[PDB]
Design a protein around this nucleic acid. Structure first.
Ligand SMILES: [Zn+2]
Lengths: 722, 162
RNA sequence: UCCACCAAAGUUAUCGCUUUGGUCAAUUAAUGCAGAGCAACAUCCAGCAAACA
DNA sequence: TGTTTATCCCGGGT
DNA sequence: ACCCGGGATAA
């Protein structure tokens, strides 16, 4: 049978035994560091050779072995067996050592001692290579297109033509036609010529641009040609031949000031990243063992650290053929447990036929994928006097994300924000050697504090991020007790109160003491305080009763408890993942509820004019989820389904101008024409019993219903929407 | 009209008994919930619930049988039940009412009034009044402080129905 | 780069519109749900500050 | 895009 | 002398 893998999310608090928690913190917090350097150092090398001689053939260096050697060079260990070294390994080590001293001096890095690191580099480095390939596939072709757009000077020509036609006073239709023909057809011809490795027609590009195309083509071999007459497809099919071409394209883009994009992937996040903890890694690093661990003893060794009796570790899946193979991933807070069934040893609704289309009578639900509203769903049986409509907005799905962003931004210490601002002042995606060195120096200067701040969950914390800070308990309008921003609990029996009349401060001090006592009893708060701190806090609370008026005890308690404000960023990421999963489940449940299990989904494509190729719209992602839940899904053309009035097929137009709701665009454009509201140009609607108003999504779904009816009756798309 | 009794101990020393008579006819749901909690037949009850809050001349409070600090408690019908009615007013001392965080947030916690509370009318449900042991109520109140903290630990040692 | 959800009315299938009533686990918590079975996770990166009409 | 597990040599310590 | 790491390589 084919190999398949499943993953289960868990927390270290639930599955990991306490005795072996601290060593893991030492492992991950180290690995995430080395891996980061394993990226930067690599790029450093690629900048020292290419900057000196572009003829350097670094394409061979893009392999897992080179990344493994780079990772090992950052680890100090006893000398090994030089006789068994391979020639490729010798060359890689010599190349690394050529710049090792310079890179260490620039980054102020010291070789970290880590025995048995060989078994670790094989995993993380395997991902590093994956970063180099996929990234190119994700950015090469598109970026190439952008360069062409800059080579053709598309924007300048469009602006000049727009000004000329405004002087001539042409209408919108005429201007758009003139552009789409005169300015685009030559651009399409040039793009096709570049795609088929052919120089574009002379006269469409100036010398300063033809030289760029010639230089870009010089990178490839004389006899090499793009597979299937498509450079875009060739890049995906044979990425190995475009690394040098991709680097040259990035250099040209930087020369032309295109939007920055990282040619060489780099790990910039300071939060510890997930790493794979293999049985061997567990044996040699977590268990601190000093002998071989075979497969037979693999499960026995694993059981000494984690509780295999938990619900997550046991078998799962149909016939329970998926078994846990002693391999998992973790970043020190969250854990992804992997299970596998194999050993570890190495269609558009318009194209449906009658027999298919006519089976959904009364079951089709038309979905408009709004840019702001993720889905606007209307059942084909909906009536004007009996609405059957649902709305799923992107804001609802991003509620947790925005909440966590606000929490992170509000709780950011002054030092941390200053360091982040200083670091961001240095360009990172640029391939310039000097700028990269400056960025490395800045990162080395700021890491000492950034890693400490973002590693507060597991790493030691000694900096006073909140000096001279006073925190007092407060209760919101919903009877929730907060310290400064931490949630303590909900006092559901707090509303009954007399007329306050704050006659004495001692009563307020007693209330503060009661709130402190309530807070200290919480399970999720006590565990965050060590025994000495808890005893000191209890002593201060006792003293407060003797001297309630004095604020020194409150200040001391606040200073002691200041540690609580350090956000558990990894816990925040885990909560975000859980919230996303729960929101998807909620969407599925709501769809099944308000429309029933018989709902059949019809989804639009885009609001832009008609296109007949890839067009990588984001909706392609969402469709993956719905089909996995059992909802039939079909596509319907949308390019012209929002231009005509459903009532009488007349033209629709935006008529209401409202203040711009987007804060970053208000100053640049205080008022904008409403997009979600439309009116029909025909005035006879008033006789039916002003113009008839419509919502963009409502009109789109009505047009989709009309198209579906036309397909059912005549098996052809309406000419109006064609 | 169900009648219930509590035997109260402070720091392990019994202090007396208090008897409440409920308004089953006018407030059936709240009275039934209070009776069920007192009996403890469903598996939980006020038995051992501390008097975590006592404001002298204002109120006594209790019924937190899961945290003992005012954050716990749950009714037999679930975590919350809608407010029943406000046909009774806090016009006399010794009236028993349900504690809540706001409109339609009644749980299992309860409070006993010691003075007229006209301002509480229309916001809390009253479902019974003290028929005996008001002296014990005053004795318990004397151990409280304006901030609500009690000078000594006070718990409902026993609860039952007559 | 701020914006939780449902319903009545201005209102005609009326908007990042307006006036009301209802919804809540709040959360720096928990692997999630059903009522013992199910559930892809991670590095890079596009998110938007618009890369292809 | 990926989801590890064995074998061999020699320098050092008892 | 003889056994125990620890790196390196390989499928
Ligand atoms: Zn019309």
């Amino acid at each position: 049978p084919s190999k398949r893998v499943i993953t289960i999310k868990t927390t270290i608090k639930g599955i990991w035994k306490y005795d072996y928690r601290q060593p893991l913190y030492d492992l991950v917090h180290t690995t995430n560091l080395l891996v980061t350097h394993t990226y930067a150092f690599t790029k450093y090398i690629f900048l020292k050779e290419l900057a000196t001689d572009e003829n350097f053939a670094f394409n061979e260096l893009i392999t897992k072995d080179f990344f493994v050697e780079v990772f090992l060079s950052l680890v100090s260990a006893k000398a090994g067996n030089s006789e068994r070294l391979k020639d490729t390994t010798k060359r890689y080590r010599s190349l690394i050592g050529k710049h090792k001293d310079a890179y260490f001096e620039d980054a102020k890095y010291t070789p970290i001692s880590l025995a048995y690191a060989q078994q670790i580099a094989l995993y993380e480095c395997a991902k590093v290579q994956t970063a180099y390939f996929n990234n190119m596939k994700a950015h090469f072709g598109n970026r190439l297109r952008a360069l062409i757009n800059k080579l053709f000077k598309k924007k300048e020509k469009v602006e000049s033509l727009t000004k000329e036609m405004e002087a001539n006073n042409f209408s919108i239709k005429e201007i758009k036609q003139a552009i789409r023909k005169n300015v685009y057809q030559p651009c399409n011809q040039v793009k096709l010529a570049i795609t088929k490795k052919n120089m574009p027609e002379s006269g469409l590009l100036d010398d300063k641009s033809v030289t760029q195309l010639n230089e870009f083509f010089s990178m490839y071999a004389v006899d090499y040609t793009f597979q299937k007459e498509s450079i875009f497809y060739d890049v995906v099919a044979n990425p190995e031949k475009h690394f040098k071409a991709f680097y040259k394209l990035a250099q040209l883009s930087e020369a032309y000031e295109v939007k920055p994009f990282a040619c060489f992937p780099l790990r910039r996040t300071f939060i510890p990243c997930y790493m794979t903890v293999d049985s061997k890694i567990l044996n040699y690093h977590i268990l601190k063992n000093k002998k071989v661990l075979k497969m037979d003893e693999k499960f026995n060794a694993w059981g000494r650290v984690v509780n295999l009796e938990r619900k997550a570790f046991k078998s799962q899946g149909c016939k329970k053929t998926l078994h846990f193979q002693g391999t998992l991933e973790t970043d020190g807070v969250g854990v992804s447990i992997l299970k596998q069934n194999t050993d570890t040893n190495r269609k558009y609704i318009e194209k449906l036929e009658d027999a298919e289309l006519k089976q959904t009578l009364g079951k089709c639900v038309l979905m408009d994928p709004g840019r702001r509203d993720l889905l606007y769903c209307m059942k084909e049986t909906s009536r004007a006097d009996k609405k059957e409509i649902m709305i799923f907005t992107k804001n609802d799905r991003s509620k947790c994300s925005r909440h966590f962003r606000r929490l992170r931004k509000l709780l950011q210490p002054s030092q941390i924000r200053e360091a982040e601002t200083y670091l961001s002042g240095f360009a990172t995606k640029s391939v310039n050697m000097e700028k990269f060195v400056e960025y490395i120096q800045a990162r080395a200067s700021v890491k000492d504090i950034l890693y400490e701040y973002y590693g507060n969950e597991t790493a030691k914390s000694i900096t006073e991020f909140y000096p001279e800070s006073q925190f007092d308990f407060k209760v919101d309008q919903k009877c929730n007790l907060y310290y400064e921003n931490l949630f303590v609990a909900k006092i559901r029996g707090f509303y009954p109160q007399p007329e306050h009349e704050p006659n004495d401060i001692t009563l307020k001090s007693h209330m503060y003491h009661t709130y402190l006592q309530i807070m200290l009893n919480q399970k999720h708060i006590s565990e965050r305080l060590n025994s000495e701190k808890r005893r000191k806090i209890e002593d201060l609370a006792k003293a407060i009763l003797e001297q309630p008026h004095e604020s020194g005890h409150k200040t001391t308690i606040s200073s002691l408890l200041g540690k609580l404000r350090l956000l558990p960023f990894r816990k925040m990421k885990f909560s975000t993942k859980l919230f996303s999963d729960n929101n998807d489940r909620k969407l599925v449940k709501n769809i099944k509820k308000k429309f029933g299990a018989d709902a059949v989904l019809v989804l639009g494509n885009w609001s832009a004019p008609n296109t007949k190729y890839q067009d990588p719209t984001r909706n392609k992602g969402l469709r993956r989820m719905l089909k996995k839940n059992g909802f039939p899904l079909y596509l319907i053309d949308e390019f012209r389904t929002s231009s005509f009035c459903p009532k009488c097929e007349s033209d629709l137009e935006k008529f209401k101008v409202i203040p711009n709701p987007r804060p970053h665009n208000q100053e640049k454009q205080p008022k904008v024409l409403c997009h979600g509201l439309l009116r029909c140009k025909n005035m006879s609607c008033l006789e039916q019993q002003n113009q008839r108003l419509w919502n963009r999504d409502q009109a789109a779904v009505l047009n989709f219903r009309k198209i579906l009816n036309c397909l059912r009756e005549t098996k052809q798309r309406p000419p109006l929407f064609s | 009209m169900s009648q219930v009794y509590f035997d109260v101990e402070a720091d392990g020393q019994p202090i007396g008994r208090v008897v409440f008579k409920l308004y089953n006819d006018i407030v059936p749901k709240t009275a039934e919930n209070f009776r069920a909690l007192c009996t403890g037949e469903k598996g939980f009850g006020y038995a051992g619930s501390p008097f975590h809050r006592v404001i002298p001349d204002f109120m006594l409070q209790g019924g937190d049988f899961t945290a003992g600090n005012g954050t716990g408690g749950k009714s037999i019908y679930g975590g919350k039940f809608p407010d029943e009615n406000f046909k009774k007013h806090h016009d006399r001392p010794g009236l028993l009412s349900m504690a809540n965080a706001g409109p339609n947030t009644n749980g299992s916690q309860f409070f006993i009034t010691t003075v007229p509370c006209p301002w509480l009318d229309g916001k809390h449900v009253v479902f019974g009044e003290v028929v005996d042991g008001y002296d014990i109520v005053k004795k318990v109140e004397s151990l409280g402080s304006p901030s609500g903290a009690t000078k000594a630990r006070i718990v409902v040692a026993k609860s039952g129905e007559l």
